[PDB]
Motif scaffolding. Structure first.
Motif, PDB file in Angstrom:
ATOM      1  N   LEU A   1       0.807  -1.218   0.000  1.00  0.00           N
ATOM      2  CA  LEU A   1       0.000   0.000   0.000  1.00  0.00           C
ATOM      3  C   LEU A   1       0.847   1.278   0.000  1.00  0.00           C
ATOM      4  O   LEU A   1       0.683   2.123  -0.876  1.00  0.00           O
ATOM      5  CB  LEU A   1      -0.995  -0.027   1.177  1.00  0.00           C
ATOM      6  CG  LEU A   1      -1.709   1.209   1.748  1.00  0.00           C
ATOM      7  CD1 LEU A   1      -2.237   2.132   0.684  1.00  0.00           C
ATOM      8  CD2 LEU A   1      -2.850   0.752   2.650  1.00  0.00           C
TER       9      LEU A   1
ATOM     10  N   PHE B   1      -5.719   5.148   5.062  1.00  0.00           N
ATOM     11  CA  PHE B   1      -6.549   5.118   3.865  1.00  0.00           C
ATOM     12  C   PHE B   1      -6.804   6.505   3.254  1.00  0.00           C
ATOM     13  O   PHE B   1      -6.532   6.709   2.069  1.00  0.00           O
ATOM     14  CB  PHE B   1      -7.855   4.360   4.102  1.00  0.00           C
ATOM     15  CG  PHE B   1      -8.781   4.403   2.932  1.00  0.00           C
ATOM     16  CD1 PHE B   1      -8.528   3.635   1.809  1.00  0.00           C
ATOM     17  CD2 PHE B   1      -9.879   5.244   2.934  1.00  0.00           C
ATOM     18  CE1 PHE B   1      -9.370   3.684   0.713  1.00  0.00           C
ATOM     19  CE2 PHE B   1     -10.725   5.301   1.839  1.00  0.00           C
ATOM     20  CZ  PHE B   1     -10.472   4.516   0.729  1.00  0.00           C
TER      21      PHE B   1
ATOM     22  N   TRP C   1      -8.342  -1.366  -1.878  1.00  0.00           N
ATOM     23  CA  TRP C   1      -8.575  -1.019  -0.467  1.00  0.00           C
ATOM     24  C   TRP C   1      -9.950  -0.432  -0.135  1.00  0.00           C
ATOM     25  O   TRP C   1     -10.321  -0.375   1.032  1.00  0.00           O
ATOM     26  CB  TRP C   1      -7.490  -0.085   0.047  1.00  0.00           C
ATOM     27  CG  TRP C   1      -6.113  -0.633  -0.100  1.00  0.00           C
ATOM     28  CD1 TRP C   1      -5.154  -0.209  -0.970  1.00  0.00           C
ATOM     29  CD2 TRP C   1      -5.524  -1.697   0.661  1.00  0.00           C
ATOM     30  NE1 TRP C   1      -4.004  -0.937  -0.799  1.00  0.00           N
ATOM     31  CE2 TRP C   1      -4.203  -1.860   0.195  1.00  0.00           C
ATOM     32  CE3 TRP C   1      -5.983  -2.521   1.700  1.00  0.00           C
ATOM     33  CZ2 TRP C   1      -3.336  -2.825   0.720  1.00  0.00           C
ATOM     34  CZ3 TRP C   1      -5.120  -3.472   2.229  1.00  0.00           C
ATOM     35  CH2 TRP C   1      -3.812  -3.617   1.735  1.00  0.00           C
TER      36      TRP C   1
ATOM     37  N   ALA D   1      -8.061  -7.292  -1.576  1.00  0.00           N
ATOM     38  CA  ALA D   1      -6.700  -6.893  -1.220  1.00  0.00           C
ATOM     39  C   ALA D   1      -5.646  -7.924  -1.637  1.00  0.00           C
ATOM     40  O   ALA D   1      -4.667  -7.599  -2.322  1.00  0.00           O
ATOM     41  CB  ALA D   1      -6.601  -6.609   0.271  1.00  0.00           C
TER      42      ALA D   1
END
Ligand SMILES: *[C@@H]1O[C@H](CO)[C@@H](O[C@@H]2O[C@H](CO)[C@@H](O[C@@H]3O[C@H](CO)[C@@H](O)[C@H](O[C@H]4O[C@H](CO)[C@@H](O)[C@H](O)[C@@H]4O)[C@@H]3O)[C@H](O)[C@H]2NC(C)=O)[C@H](O)[C@H]1NC(C)=O
Ligand SMILES: *[C@@H]1O[C@H](CO)[C@@H](O[C@@H]2O[C@H](CO)[C@@H](O[C@@H]3O[C@H](CO)[C@@H](O)[C@H](O[C@H]4O[C@H](CO)[C@@H](O)[C@H](O)[C@@H]4O)[C@@H]3O)[C@H](O)[C@H]2NC(C)=O)[C@H](O)[C@H]1NC(C)=O
Ligand SMILES: *[C@@H]1O[C@H](CO)[C@@H](O[C@@H]2O[C@H](CO)[C@@H](O)[C@H](O)[C@H]2NC(C)=O)[C@H](O)[C@H]1NC(C)=O
Ligand SMILES: *[C@@H]1O[C@H](CO)[C@@H](O[C@@H]2O[C@H](CO)[C@@H](O)[C@H](O)[C@H]2NC(C)=O)[C@H](O)[C@H]1NC(C)=O
Ligand SMILES: *C/C=C(C)/C=C/C=C(C)/C=C/C1=C(C)CCCC1(C)C
Ligand SMILES: *C/C=C(C)/C=C/C=C(C)/C=C/C1=C(C)CCCC1(C)C
Ligand SMILES: CCCCCCCCO[C@@H]1O[C@H](CO)[C@@H](O)[C@H](O)[C@H]1O
Ligand SMILES: CCCCCCCCO[C@@H]1O[C@H](CO)[C@@H](O)[C@H](O)[C@H]1O
Ligand SMILES: CCCCCCCCO[C@@H]1O[C@H](CO)[C@@H](O)[C@H](O)[C@H]1O
Ligand SMILES: CCCCCCCCO[C@@H]1O[C@H](CO)[C@@H](O)[C@H](O)[C@H]1O
Ligand SMILES: *C(=O)CCCCCCCCCCCCCCC
Ligand SMILES: *C(=O)CCCCCCCCCCCCCCC
Lengths: 326, 326
Positions: free
Chosen positions: B125, B212, B265, B295
């Protein structure tokens, strides 16, 4: 006594402890652990997830790209359709049954699944032969004043469907039969059981000779020539780097194609031969699964080799997939 | 009452019929049929078969091709290593457990698997963030007299491992926890259970905001700029067809990258948010599996998008795979 016979089948496990059941009636968890049935499901799932896109993509990209639609490509279209017969006839059915732990569609399902799977891999097999013939014909020009065109391509395709039917039809009607193989979740040709009411011994000989030796010989001859012709033409143009390159590329390809054919059918032919030779033999459900593993997984590697390594098909695929261009 | 609480876990099924067992002690075949556990095994198997080659190949081809080994590529190397943590920490473990029907490695295994899987997807990520920063820095040149080089690449990579640890470490030691998720075969961060001894509510807010929203904002800004800069430079060279092409290509790529990040995500963030908002909620084991599906499967689509659509990497891969050249 290493197996358990039944009217319509042969379980490769001894019923001396009384636990063996019909592969048409109950889970076979005595010849392999449940997780192994799951692994079987896993591999069918892989083969579907890759096998479907690769082969469907081939068909679809051809509908969208004029340049692909040449006669010399008809047979590769045929290859892809064969691969799909295997995907929907064989792979999906096996995924479903493996998870039940036995062949839940009974004996007539066993005939159906066995036919369409066998028909598929057979069309695939003869397609790879016809191509070698066609290429050799086109490159070596063994016939004076001949040009390969549409009509021939059609003949090639049809010949493929006839040779396949000559294999997959007989067992439906008396010459050999279809019985659950290996882990009893999928049906194939009975090539290992001595069963004489149907005449297994003559069929296996017919298969080995007509459907393995003949093909293997035609492929080696055709491609042997092809490579010879190409090597000879390049020894006569050593000033063209292009020509030297094409020659190396054509040679590596043929070696890949030939090895790939062996990997695909040698195990079925090899095992069939051993069992024939060594009359009384005991092979387990997992061992007897290995030939199908090799053949079935070609529904993926065949189009990778014959379709995707090709410069043209590749381009169009990328165009079709990227909606527009690059 | 829609679940069954336990000291170390939460089974999304009601124990009113007395059948619920610890996901550490017995098969959970009451919250999903065995075949569905097999399908879970199947999908992990797919993710390993594709995920391992794609990501290992990336590492390996880099060792073999000098031209790939630039600083601006370090982060993609990092991406691949993250993906492998997911493959060996998450995927293989889940394949094994799914086939047992419960998390056989007990609570400390639950910590281990949860850590390495989480650490992996987190590094992945933040890698996708750092890249967007680095690209924007290199293309938009927001700092006078600056040249992106090795040292920065190292910082970028390290920053990635720090941001990840800031997510995966806390639950090991008091702030949130690791418990079996969905079908109880794999462990993740507890982001749905009100559990206050560990402080789930503050952690979920921390995750949602810091891990996020921050990332999503940085990516949109960085790439928004990048596209703006590139679009502006091309409106000033409309006589170069090259330049117009590169501009379209850069734009399609950013749209693919941004959408891909959302697909990866948004479900974890979206579900986490809903459950937080709607205090008392009942979600099943299968539903609660969907976020991990999205994911985890990025261990495949990320390198497809960031590595394989790249012209260079592609070439070297083909060279390395074809032993010699073409
Ligand atoms: C592998 O080994 C096992 C044991 O050899 C074998 O399973 C057995 O099959 C027989 C039938 O062939 C089963 O016999 C039945 O048992 C029940 C008991 O509930 C009987 O009631 C059945 O009916 C008989 O008796 C009736 C008398 O009124 C008659 O009306 C009727 O027609 C039958 O004669 C029948 O006897 C036996 O139970 C199983 N044993 C086990 C352990 O399951 C199995 O078939 C072999 N595998 C293969 C693939 O052939
Ligand atoms: C979901 O629901 C079920 C039922 O509510 C629940 O399973 C039950 O767990 C209890 C223990 O918490 C089990 O109780 C045991 O039963 C055995 C019978 O063989 C007893 O011998 C055990 O020992 C007790 O009695 C002894 C007296 O001498 C004491 O020495 C000892 O310390 C114990 O007091 C014990 O009572 C019960 O059998 C199960 N029931 C079922 C149907 O399995 C389950 O735990 C719940 N799920 C979750 C995830 O919490
Ligand atoms: C079934 O059982 C055994 C295999 O376990 C077979 O016996 C083998 O083959 C011959 C006997 O014909 C012996 O020389 C070997 O020593 C045996 N091998 C082993 C590993 O023990 C038997 O032939 C099999 N028979 C059938 C009908 O399946
Ligand atoms: C568990 O059971 C039900 C869901 O089946 C939940 O009740 C729902 O939510 C509210 C009650 O707070 C009602 O307005 C809805 O009509 C119910 N939905 C349905 C589909 O019946 C309940 O809240 C859940 N509680 C917990 C603690 O999990
Ligand atoms: C799913 C399994 C499939 C489609 C298997 C197909 C197998 C064959 C067509 C096997 C052919 C052969 C024999 C039966 C033995 C001799 C050699 C072969 C390869 C022609
Ligand atoms: C196998 C499953 C894995 C590796 C799952 C990893 C999941 C996360 C790192 C989840 C992160 C988030 C939340 C817990 C909720 C809020 C939003 C996220 C996406 C940062
Ligand atoms: C991809 C979809 C596959 C679905 C597979 C469902 C398999 C059903 O599997 C099981 O079969 C057993 C006997 O055959 C029974 O004992 C079980 O009750 C049944 O659930
Ligand atoms: C159908 C079987 C055809 C096999 C392909 C032909 C293999 C030829 O192989 C060639 O042999 C040459 C030496 O004569 C070498 O110089 C070449 O490097 C090599 O490609
Ligand atoms: C890729 C390798 C995966 C191997 C998975 C083997 C799973 C063992 O699965 C089963 O677990 C059950 C309880 O947990 C037991 O009842 C069974 O006896 C056992 O076979
Ligand atoms: C991080 C989010 C960035 C989104 C990418 C920018 C989308 C711009 O999209 C562009 O808009 C132009 C009209 O102004 C059109 O002419 C172009 O065809 C189109 O590519
Ligand atoms: C038209 O321009 C659209 C092109 C976008 C395609 C690029 C996205 C790559 C996706 C690969 C995903 C593979 C996942 C397989 C695991 C099930
Ligand atoms: C060096 O020159 C060797 C290059 C030969 C590679 C070409 C073979 C393609 C094989 C693809 C197989 C995919 C099978 C996946 C199913 C498990």
């Amino acid at each position: 006594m290493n197996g358990t016979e039944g009217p319509n089948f042969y379980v490769p496990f001894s019923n001396k402890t009384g636990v063996v059941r019909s592969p048409f009636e109950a889970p076979q968890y005595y010849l392999a652990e449940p997780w192994q049935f799951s692994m079987l499901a896993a591999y069918m799932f892989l083969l579907i997830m890759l096998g479907f896109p690769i082969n469907f993509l081939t068909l679809y990209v051809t509908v969208q790209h004029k340049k692909l639609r040449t006669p010399l490509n008809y047979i590769l279209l045929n290859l892809a359709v064969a691969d799909l017969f295997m995907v929907f006839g064989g792979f999906t059915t096996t995924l479903y049954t493996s998870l039940h732990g036995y062949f839940v569609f009974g004996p007539t399902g066993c005939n159906l699944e066995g036919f369409f799977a066998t028909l598929g891999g057979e069309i695939a097999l003869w397609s790879l032969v016809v191509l070698a013939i066609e290429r050799y014909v086109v490159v070596c020009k063994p016939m004076s004043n001949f040009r390969f065109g549409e009509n021939h391509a059609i003949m090639g395709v049809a010949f493929t469907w006839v040779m396949a039917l000559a294999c997959a039809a007989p067992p439906l009607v008396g010459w050999s039969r279809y019985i659950p193989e290996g882990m009893q979740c999928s049906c194939g040709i009975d090539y290992y059981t001595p069963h004489e009411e149907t005449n297994n011994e003559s069929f296996v000989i017919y298969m080995f000779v007509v459907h393995f030796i003949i093909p293997l010989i035609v492929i080696f001859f055709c491609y042997g020539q092809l490579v010879f012709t190409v090597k000879e033409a390049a020894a006569q143009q050593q000033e063209s780097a292009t020509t030297q390159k094409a020659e190396k590329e054509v040679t590596r390809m043929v070696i890949i194609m030939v090895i790939a054919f062996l990997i695909c059918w040698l195990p079925y032919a090899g095992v069939a031969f051993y069992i024939f030779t060594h009359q009384g033999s005991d092979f387990g459900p997992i061992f007897m699964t290995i030939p199908a593993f090799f053949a079935k997984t070609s529904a993926v590697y065949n189009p990778v080799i014959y379709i995707m390594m090709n410069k043209q098909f590749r381009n169009c695929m990328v165009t079709t997939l990227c909606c527009g261009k690059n």
